[PDB]
Each structure stands twice: as structure tokens, then as C-alpha cells.
């Protein structure tokens, strides 16, 4: 089997991407944030504290003839941005882009933190990291990809995120028309439950490539590119007037600037992030100070190849017995 679904930016900055997902019988379609940095499929629901729902579409398990309470199971998750959610668990039928899993754990939120309530465009998350990170207790549950894998034509999914435009998540096949050149594959460590790999270095603009190992994770659920402070300083030093602002929480730059590109290494290959992809717009409405798309990972404890980096590539999440990552230009 295969599946193919379009993923759409939630706003004009590409702060996140939403993908329609069918849950239950008859189908209830929710728009979920596909997150290769976590491993829970959770949704706003009829059980969510009413004051914490503000415009999201909810899953109502009592209206699904295929929903079953997973007795005794609870979940609770906290994300790197400080947000969180928790609740109970049903199993139900879940379809993405024509690919169907029966008996998928659907984690129904009883509580969500303010940042989720305040984002009316995201109805929940669909985790695509390794199932060892799933938070359901006392019986850990499998991700949608893990449940579908054996049925797929090939045990892979691909992320093709757009810049200010829709893109595609495919399951079970590699669309050879979606990228240029060849796909370069690189090794993955699953020891922390992430799609963790090692970049071979970087360049800033037209500058020379610096060969240096950068361990980090391919994370579709993180907006920005978080790299070591040395690398980030070298980037922003090329932008007149850019500075790290403790009060804003990162590097800012004059909105009048034209940003240089940023290149990262994948083996001997190179992925080029155009300068425009690094502009996240005014820090507050009407300001001439703009927020940077490349930020320091110091204090986070891990480097994160988030959407800023991934949307410059066609990315293969290869879930074969020994997982690997593939990157192609596009």
C-alpha cells in the first residue's frame, strides 16, 4: 500500500504545516501537525476542557462506530517549546492520504496548554519519531508509521515541505519526480528515539564550506534551524545590524536586509537554504526588527534541523531494519 497527502503552511511565515487525517467511522477529518520529533498521535476532542478549545476541530469518539476505549491508558507530553497536553486513549481507524491503519492509538486530550488553545489551525499532532518515545502508560503505543510499515510497498515516508506553499507527505514510495539529482543517504542513531544524524558541515552565502560534524535531528515539528552557537554567530555576522537579543529570545536582524543563504552538508552532498527562508518577519506587528530563522541550540541540548532546513530538501525517512535518512535538492 501507499498514501499521499498534501501538507499546508498554517500562516504566511510557515510556522508549522497541517495535513488532513481521517479518524473513525464515519470519518472525522482533523488537520494534524506531522511531527518527526515526537511519537504520539493526539487530538483535540469532545473530552478536552471546554475553556481550552478555541476554534479547533474536535474528535468525538462516541460518534465513531470503530472507536474503543483503551482501558486504563493515559498519556502526557511536554514539548521543547514548553507546551504540553494530556488525556486518555482510544483505538480507531486512521487514514492519511488513502493509507489506512486499523487499531491506531488515538490519544484524546483532556487538557492542552495555552499555546495549543491559541492556535486554532492545529487540531493535534501525528508523531513520526520512533515508537520508543510514545508516552502512553502503562502500555506504550506505536506510531501511525510503525503500524503501517509492514503493509507499505517500501518501509519509508517522505517529507517535501514547501516554502510559502503546500507540499507533500508520502508513505510507502519515493516520488522520483519530486527532486533533482540523486538522494544522498546518511546514517541514523535511534538511541534517543529521534531521526538523529550527523551533518558534514556548512557554508554561509558564497563562502567556503567548513567541514565539521554536526549531530542533530530531522524534526518537521520544529519551525526553525537550531545549530551550535559558533555556526550561528558565523551566519549572522554576515548580516549588517544583526544581533542576539536576550529580550526577544534570539537573533534579530533589520527587516531591510537581504539574507545570505546557508548550506549544510549531507555526506559529500550539499543542501542550500535560500536566504529568504531564514526571514521570520517582524518581532511584533509593525516592527522593523525581524526574527531570524537560524538560532542557537545552546541550552536546548541538541541541534535541530527543523522546517527551515527540511523545506529546502526532499527528505526520505527510511524505516528499514537499520533506519537511514535521505536528502535531495529539489
Technique used by the depositors:
X-ray
Residues 165, 193 share a domain: no
Our count of domains for the chain comes to: 2
Residues 193, 290 share a domain: yes
Whole-angstrom distance, CA of residue 130 vs CA of residue 132: 5
Residues 325, 282 share a domain: yes
* Among 174, 191, 213, residue at a domain's last position: 174
Residues 190, 121 share a domain: no
Q: Hey, CA dihedral for 124, 130, 132, 133, is it positive or negative?
A: negative
Looking at the DSSP bridge assignments, the partners of residue 78 are 84
Which three-class secondary structure state does DSSP give residue 82? coil
Residues 198, 162 share a domain: no
- CB within 8 A of 14, min separation 6: which ones? 161, 162, 163, 164, 223, 307, 311
Residues 292, 266 share a domain: yes
Residues 170, 109 share a domain: yes
Cβ atoms of residues 134 and 127 within 8 Å: yes
Which cell is 19 given? Answer: 495535513
Q: Please, what's the b/e burial string for 249-282 (b: 16 or more CB within 10 A of its CB; e: otherwise)?
A: ebbbbeeeeebbbbbbbbeebbbebebebbbbee
Cβ atoms of residues 67 and 47 within 8 Å: no
- CB within 8 A of 297, min separation 6: which ones? 216, 226, 227, 228, 229, 303, 304
Catalytic choice (38, 199, 261, 296): 199
Which cell is 271 given? Answer: 543542501
* Among 152, 174, 196, residue at a domain's last position: 174
Which cell is 30 given? Answer: 482533523
* Among 142, 174, 206, residue at a domain's last position: 174
Cβ atoms of residues 184 and 328 within 8 Å: yes
| Nearest of 250, 11, 36 to residue 128 by alpha carbon | 36
| Nearest of 278, 279, 300 to residue 288 by alpha carbon | 279
Resolution (A): 1.2
Residues 128, 209 share a domain: no
Whole-angstrom distance, CA of residue 36 vs CA of residue 39: 8
| Nearest of 304, 9, 282, 30 to residue 161 by alpha carbon | 9
Q: Which domain holds residue 205?
A: 175-330
Active site residue 35: yes
Q: Hey, CA dihedral for 301, 303, 307, 308, is it positive or negative?
A: positive
Catalytic choice (35, 40, 119, 123): 35
CATH of the domain at 191: 2.40.70.10
Residues 156, 180 share a domain: no
State the Rg of the chain over Cα. 20
| Nearest of 176, 212, 215 to residue 198 by alpha carbon | 215
| Nearest of 196, 182, 198 to residue 317 by alpha carbon | 196
Whole-angstrom distance, CA of residue 239 vs CA of residue 260: 8
Whole-angstrom distance, CA of residue 105 vs CA of residue 243: 45
CA separation (Å) from 273 to 150, 276, 307, 321, 325?
34, 8, 11, 31, 18
Q: What one-character-per-residue DSSP string does 1-17 give?
A: --EEEEEEESSTT---E
Active site residue 329: no
Q: Which helix (H) or strand (E) holds 126?
A: strand 124-127
Residues 287, 195 share a domain: yes
Residues 235, 154 share a domain: no
Q: How many CB atoms lie within 10 A of CB 234?
A: 17
Cβ atoms of residues 173 and 166 within 8 Å: no
Residues 240, 164 share a domain: no
Amino acid at each position: 500500500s501507499t498514501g499521499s497527502a498534501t501538507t499546508t503552511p498554517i500562516d504566511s511565515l510557515d510556522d508549522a504545516y497541517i495535513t488532513p487525517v481521517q479518524i473513525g467511522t464515519p470519518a472525522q477529518t482533523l488537520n494534524l501537525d506531522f511531527d518527526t520529533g515526537s511519537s504520539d498521535l493526539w487530538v483535540f476532542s469532545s473530552e478536552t476542557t471546554a475553556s481550552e478549545v478555541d476554534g479547533q476541530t474536535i474528535y468525538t469518539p462516541s460518534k465513531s462506530t470503530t472507536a474503543k476505549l483503551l482501558s486504563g491508558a493515559t498519556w502526557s507530553i511536554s514539548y521543547g517549546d514548553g507546551s504540553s497536553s494530556s488525556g486518555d486513549v482510544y483505538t480507531d481507524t486512521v487514514s492519511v492520504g488513502g493509507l489506512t491503519v486499523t487499531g491506531q492509538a488515538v490519544e484524546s486530550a483532556k487538557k492542552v496548554s495555552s499555546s495549543f488553545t491559541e492556535d486554532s489551525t492545529i487540531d493535534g499532532l501525528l508523531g513520526l519519531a520512533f515508537s520508543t518515545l510514545n508516552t502512553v502508560s502503562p502500555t506504550q503505543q506505536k506510531t501511525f508509521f510503525d503500524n503501517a510499515k509492514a503493509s507499505l510497498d517500501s518501509p519509508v515516508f517522505t517529507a517535501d515541505l514547501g516554502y510559502h506553499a503546500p507540499g507533500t507527505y508520502n508513505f510507502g514510495f519515493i516520488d522520483t519526480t519530486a527532486y533533482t539529482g540523486s538522494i544522498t543517504y546518511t546514517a541514523v542513531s535511534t538511541k534517543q528515539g529521534f531521526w538523529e544524524w550527523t551533518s558534514t558541515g556548512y557554508a554561509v552565502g558564497s563562502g567556503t564550506f567548513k567541514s565539521t560534524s554536526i549531530d542533530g535531528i530531522a524534526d518537521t515539528g520544529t519551525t526553525l534551524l537550531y545549530l551550535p552557537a559558533t555556526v550561528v554567530s558565523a551566519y549572522w555576522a554576515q548580516v549588517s545590524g544583526a544581533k542576539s537579543s536576550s529580550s526577544v529570545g534570539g537573533y534579530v536582524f533589520p527587516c531591510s536586509a537581504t539574507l545570505p543563504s546557508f548550506t549544510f552538508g549531507v555526506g559529500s552532498a550539499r543542501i542550500v537554504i535560500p536566504g529568504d527562508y531564514i526571514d521570520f518577519g517582524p518581532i511584533s506587528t509593525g516592527s522593523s526588527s525581524c526574527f531570524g530563522g537560524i538560532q542557537s541550540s545552546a541550552g536546548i541540548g541538541i541541534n535541530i534541523f527543523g522546517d527551515v532546513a527540511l523545506k529546502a530538501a526532499f527528505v526520505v525517512f527510511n524505516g528499514a531494519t537499520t533506519p537511514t535518512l535521505g536528502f535531495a535538492s529539489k
